[PDB]
Structure 1
Amino acid sequence: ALGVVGVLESYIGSINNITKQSACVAMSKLLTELNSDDIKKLRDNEELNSPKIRVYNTVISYIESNRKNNKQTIHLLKRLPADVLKKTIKNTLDIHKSITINN
């Protein structure tokens, strides 16, 4: 808990009693920080049948939703079944880590 990354890792890992609401609020903050052009660039570094391309595209779709409306996207994420939400968070965190390391 405390800090976007701490909250999201904790939610995925089922520690620190993170509520669904808190995780989705932190996700919105992370998506705001991510740049979809950066991710499209990472995506295009991949070979044509890399499984990563599909993943990159889902995270691009989250960023685009969040950009149009933060609060609506928080509500949307909160409606995903918890297992679906955690995979969403993991893929987004993974892309955040890649960009951070290579900056």
Structure 2
Amino acid sequence: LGSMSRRNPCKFEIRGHCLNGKRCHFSHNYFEWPPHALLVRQNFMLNRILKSMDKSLDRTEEYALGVVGVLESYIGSINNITKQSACVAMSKLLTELNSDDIKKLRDNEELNSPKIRVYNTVISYIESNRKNNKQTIHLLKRLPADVLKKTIKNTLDIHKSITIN
């Protein structure tokens, strides 16, 4: 008939690599895992590969707000958000976006629509931020509050927009 039983996938392994040696009784053999476990492991591992190739507001309130909450809070001068913090979070936001999405938007516009100007500006900041975020940050720090908060607002709008169409 077979064995009564099969071994379940190891939860440590689903998150990366099990560090428990032979002491461990769960399965570490991908050929016997159900698909869901293998799909979950792939997402943990992709996060790890991506983090380990990255180049270089950790407190409780900032974490709960996230980069978006911090940026929204700076624009409304609430929650005690400095301009320094808002400029780091902005780099983080720009790293999360990608130009190719701005470009699909950009080409849905009537010619010399004013929105084409804002797109190309955000696109420009993504590229710069990709090259060197530390440079890019400084650059945001020199912008006057009013214009900074407007660029930010533009970026957040596009961020949301891309994700809900």
Q: Same fold (TM over 0.5)?
A: yes
Unmatched 5+ residue regions in structure 1?
A: none
Larger deviation: 43-52 or 23-32? 43-52
Q: TM-score, normalised by structure 1?
A: 0.94
Identity rate of aligned residues, in percent? 100
Report the equivalent of 1:64: 127
- Once residues 141 and 65 of structure 2 are traced to their aligned partners in structure 1, the CA distance between those partners, rounded to angstroms, is 19
Cα distance, 1:47 vs structure 2: 1.1
- Once residues 74 and 47 of structure 1 are traced to their aligned partners in structure 2, the CA distance between those partners, rounded to angstroms, is 32
SS for the counterpart of 2:79 is: coil
Alignment of 1:52 onto 2:123: no
Q: TM-score, normalised by structure 2?
A: 0.59
- Once residues 53 and 80 of structure 1 are traced to their aligned partners in structure 2, the CA distance between those partners, rounded to angstroms, is 21
Cα distance, 1:49 vs structure 2: 3.0
Cα distance, 1:64 vs structure 2: 1.0
Cα distance, 1:2 vs structure 2: 2.7
SS for the counterpart of 1:2 is: helix
Cα distance, 1:93 vs structure 2: 0.6
SS for the counterpart of 2:105 is: helix
Quick one: which of 91, 97, 120 aligns to 1:28? Answer: 91
SS for the counterpart of 2:65 is: coil
Residue deviations 1:7-49 (CA, integer Å, cap 9, x gap): 0000111111110011000000010000101101110011113
SS for the counterpart of 1:59 is: helix
**Structure number with bigger Rg:** 2
- Once residues 49 and 70 of structure 1 are traced to their aligned partners in structure 2, the CA distance between those partners, rounded to angstroms, is 30
Cα distance, 1:100 vs structure 2: 1.3
Unmatched 5+ residue regions in structure 2?
A: 1-63
RMSD over equivalenced CA pairs, Å: 1.1
- Once residues 71 and 100 of structure 1 are traced to their aligned partners in structure 2, the CA distance between those partners, rounded to angstroms, is 27
List, as ranges, runs of 4+ consecutive aligned residues in structure 1 with deviation greater than 3 Å.
Answer: none
Cα distance, 1:53 vs structure 2: 0.7
Number of equivalenced pairs: 102
SS for the counterpart of 2:153 is: helix
- Once residues 21 and 75 of structure 1 are traced to their aligned partners in structure 2, the CA distance between those partners, rounded to angstroms, is 9
- Once residues 13 and 62 of structure 1 are traced to their aligned partners in structure 2, the CA distance between those partners, rounded to angstroms, is 23
Alignment of 1:11 onto 2:38: no
Residue deviations 1:56-100 (CA, integer Å, cap 9, x gap): 111111111101101111111011111111011011111101011
